[PDB]
Amino acid sequence: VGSVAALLTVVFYIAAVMATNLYGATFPEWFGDLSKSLYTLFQVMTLESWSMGIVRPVMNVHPNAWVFFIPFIMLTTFTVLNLFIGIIVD
Amino acid sequence: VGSVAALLTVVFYIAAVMATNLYGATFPEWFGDLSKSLYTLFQVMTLESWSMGIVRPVMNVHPNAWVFFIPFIMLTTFTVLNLFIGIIVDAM
Amino acid sequence: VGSVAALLTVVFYIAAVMATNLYGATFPEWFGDLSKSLYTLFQVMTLESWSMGIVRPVMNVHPNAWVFFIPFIMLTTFTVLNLFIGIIVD
Amino acid sequence: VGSVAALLTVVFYIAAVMATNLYGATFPEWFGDLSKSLYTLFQVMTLESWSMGIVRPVMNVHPNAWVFFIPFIMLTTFTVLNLFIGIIVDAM
Numbered sequence: 001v002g003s004v005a006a007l008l009t010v011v012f013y014i015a016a017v018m019a020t021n022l023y024g025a026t027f028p029e030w031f032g033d034l035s036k037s038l039y040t041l042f043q044v045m046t047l048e049s050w051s052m053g054i055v056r057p058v059m060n061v062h063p064n065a066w067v068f069f070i071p072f073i074m075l076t077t078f079t080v081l082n083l084f085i086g087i088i089v090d
Numbered sequence: 091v092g093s094v095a096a097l098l099t100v101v102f103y104i105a106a107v108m109a110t111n112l113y114g115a116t117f118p119e120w121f122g123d124l125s126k127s128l129y130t131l132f133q134v135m136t137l138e139s140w141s142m143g144i145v146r147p148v149m150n151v152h153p154n155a156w157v158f159f160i161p162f163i164m165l166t167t168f169t170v171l172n173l174f175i176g177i178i179v180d181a182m
Numbered sequence: 183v184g185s186v187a188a189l190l191t192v193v194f195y196i197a198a199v200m201a202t203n204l205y206g207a208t209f210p211e212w213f214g215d216l217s218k219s220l221y222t223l224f225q226v227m228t229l230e231s232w233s234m235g236i237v238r239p240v241m242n243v244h245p246n247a248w249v250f251f252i253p254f255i256m257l258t259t260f261t262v263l264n265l266f267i268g269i270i271v272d
Numbered sequence: 273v274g275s276v277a278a279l280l281t282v283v284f285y286i287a288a289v290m291a292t293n294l295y296g297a298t299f300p301e302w303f304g305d306l307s308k309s310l311y312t313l314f315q316v317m318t319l320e321s322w323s324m325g326i327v328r329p330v331m332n333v334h335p336n337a338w339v340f341f342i343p344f345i346m347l348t349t350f351t352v353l354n355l356f357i358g359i360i361v362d363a364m
């Protein structure tokens with residue numbers, strides 16, 4: 001469980017490092033600093049306006065942005081539930 | 091589990107083939123090519139703006155569009171969770 | 183499981199009968215006929231724009247509309263997961 | 273289970289007391305009275321427009337508003353599922 005929470009933090013920071021670099025210049029309100037990114041990625045992880053709100057307007061500049069977001073969502077959303085189930089089991 | 095992931099991919103591609111044909115001409119931004127569709131259907135699967143954002147404006151042109159989306163949502167959303175639970179069970 | 187699916191259908195139709203009567207005249211696009219309602223209630227059940235999209239504009243006319251929606255959401259969302267878990271267990 | 277439901281109500285009321293005080297003057301439609309807050313926090317708990325709809329416009333006035341909402345979401349969303357699983361377990 002502690003190992004799962006460790007993996008998620010490592011993935012979460014690395015993803016926010018990558019997102020800052022990739023879309024920060026073109027989309028500063030969402031990926032401007034590392035902070036803005038960690039906030040946006042948590043939001044995208046919770047799925048609130050992930051597509052119409054974030055990915056779709058982002059893809060209008062970077063057409064392959066989905067190669068980062070869809071796997072991010074697939075990974076984090078799986079891990080978060082898996083971690084929460086693990087807490088409940090323990 | 092691998093069989094569940096196989097079913098989902100087959101369903102996902104067939105649904106995106108169908109959606110492209112059905113609503114692609116009337117709604118090109120969302121169902122224009124097969125690619126646009128696979129992206130939209132994953133989004134509809136995660137439920138982000140599925141109705142107000144997609145189904146409702148789609149239904150304004152095709153009034154029975156709900157016959158495709160509601161079962162799609164019921165099937166995929168069930169399968170995804172069922173697959174993820176299956177991964178967790180096979181891990182323990 | 184079949185009993186759970188039966189309860190949900192009964193609740194779902196009764197809620198759509200009630201919603202049609204309550205907000206159909208004032209909000210026809212969402213609760214006009216019984217059909218429009220069954221569609222809106224499934225959407226509200228999935229949570230897509232339940233508040234900002236439906237409840238909030240509805241409450242601007244009917245200020246207590248939350249007494250119907252919040253319990254509806256609490257009941258249906260519990261039952262749906264409970265049913266899906268039941269299918270998986272069986 | 274009853275203890276979990278008790279914790280959630282205590283947390284839910286305290287959070288809505290805090291939110292009313294913090295953002296009520298600047299955002300009255302959402303955190304004006306204690307009632308408006310309990311409604312908004314349930315909505316934020318279900319995640320419907322939590323960020324683009326609530327937190328993001330709130331953060332434009334209070335830049336650290338995320339210190340209240342993100343932990344609120346992490347706590348309540350965990351507890352709600354944990355309670356619902358607990359009901360299901362106690363039923364079997």
Ligand SMILES: [Br-]
Pocket residue numbers: 073074077136170
């Ligand atoms: Br998912």
Ligand SMILES: [Br-]
Pocket residue numbers: 255256259318352
């Ligand atoms: Br809920």
Ligand code: NA
Pocket residue numbers: 048049138139231321
């Ligand atoms: Na939304």
Ligand code: NA
Pocket residue numbers: 047048136137138229230319
């Ligand atoms: Na959602």
Ligand code: NA
Pocket residue numbers: 047137228229318319
């Ligand atoms: Na959701």
